[PDB]
Amino acid sequence: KCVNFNFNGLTGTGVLTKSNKKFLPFQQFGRDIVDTTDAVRDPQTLEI
Amino acid sequence: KVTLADAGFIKQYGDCLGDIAARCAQKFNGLTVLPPLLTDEMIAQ
Ligand SMILES: *[C@@H]1O[C@H](CO)[C@@H](O)[C@H](O)[C@H]1NC(C)=O
């Protein structure tokens, strides 16, 4: 659903869904082709 | 022979993907493309 969110200081508005991206253990944020954030690691569950 | 990259349609359901941006704003940054009034079939006619 479209919610506001704040993930460890990164804030914004959007719909959060299950990702099929595989982040390596040191990665916290992901970005798309245009250098805007498009995925996060949950600070508590570590799900992408 | 000609590949048209924009080819505007209803792409919000299309946009959701693993690599969401897939692109030329993907609509999200405020840039969209309107369809032509005459479709390719109408021009062919
Ligand atoms: C944070 O605490 C919760 C408590 O249930 C735990 O399940 C979770 O794994 C913890 N996360 C980290 C990163 O320690």
Side-chain angles (χ1 to χ4, degrees), chain A residues 42-46:
Chain A
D42 185 81
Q44 297 225 8
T45 311
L46 309 188

Side-chain angles (χ1 to χ4, degrees), chain A residues 7 18 20 25 42-43:
Chain A
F7 286 93
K18 184 24 180 71
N20 40 326
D42 185 81

Side-chain angles (χ1 to χ4, degrees), chain A residues 3-15:
Chain A
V3 288
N4 283 320
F5 56 83
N6 185 324
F7 286 93
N8 220 347
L10 178 70
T11 166
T13 302
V15 179

Side-chain angles (χ1 to χ4, degrees), chain A residues 17 19-21 32-34 36 38, chain B residues 16-23 29:
Chain A
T17 172
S19 180
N20 40 326
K21 293 178 179 181
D32 67 8
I33 180 148
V34 154
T36 186
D38 89 355
Chain B
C16 178
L17 189 146
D19 289 345
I20 294 169
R23 189 84 64 52
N29 289 288

